[PDB]
Amino acid sequence: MPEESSPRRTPQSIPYQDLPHLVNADGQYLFCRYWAPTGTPKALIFVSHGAGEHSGRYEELARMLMGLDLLVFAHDHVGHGQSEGERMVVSDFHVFVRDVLQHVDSMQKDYPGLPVFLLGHSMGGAIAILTAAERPGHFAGMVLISPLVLANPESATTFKVLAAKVGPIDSSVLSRNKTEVDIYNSDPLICRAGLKVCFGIQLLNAVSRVERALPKLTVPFLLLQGSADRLCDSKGAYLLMELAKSQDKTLKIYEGAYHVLHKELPEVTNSVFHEINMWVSQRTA
């Protein structure tokens, strides 16, 4: 008599049979999270986390969102969090987009006729842009927290020279809020290893694809950028503002703020939480 294989486990040895999951096109398991409101959801919203991080970091945002009677759902991108795959490795950047579309396609079927929003930060924001541009007309609304549209020139050129000759980021540039930098540095699911070269060329590659997709955007969106962001240049968010065709487009600059605006100084963070709340609320009522 043949036997079933020993259960599939996350890279932290938890059986997938125990967690919300989905199998992707390459047969890799993805860890999933769901925040479901009491009663009928007004809409669906997918949260796309950034490079090195994981969906767990979006707990508070997602609870506010679910607060407005939306169904929030997320998964960890491949090579992130509790999803399978070599840490911060992807065959091609398009995998992230495809994997989102799959999760949305699934969720839409289970919840027919509901509008769907995207929320992304950083690389997760670049993924949201590409996701939207691949399906013009399909998403109700897009919320972008300092999305990767243009990469910091100082840093990009440094990396390009280093790559041309083939270290971990100073995590202080994340946030003026030093408690949040510390929380980041002590989260076991994060990948704080230096940026591999193959993944770094991929991100500069995504910058290029994002610029090509900009003119094709028609989806409504809210765009939150810090003026002193040393990872995703603020110039990128002006470009998005200029090139997108969306009839419904809005930009908040946070003067002096760094990169992770939902994890910044409370004045900033509270504003970020409020604007997202106001915007999504107006477009679901």
Ligand SMILES: Cc1ccc(COC2CN(C(=O)[C@H]3C[C@]4(COC(=O)N4)C3)C2)cc1Cl
């Ligand atoms: C050389 C170079 C420099 C800068 C970028 C772009 O900056 C990246 C930072 N990236 C994220 O996605 C992470 C930031 C983080 C961590 O945890 C959070 O909450 N925020 C998510 C995008 C690309 C390249 Cl090639």
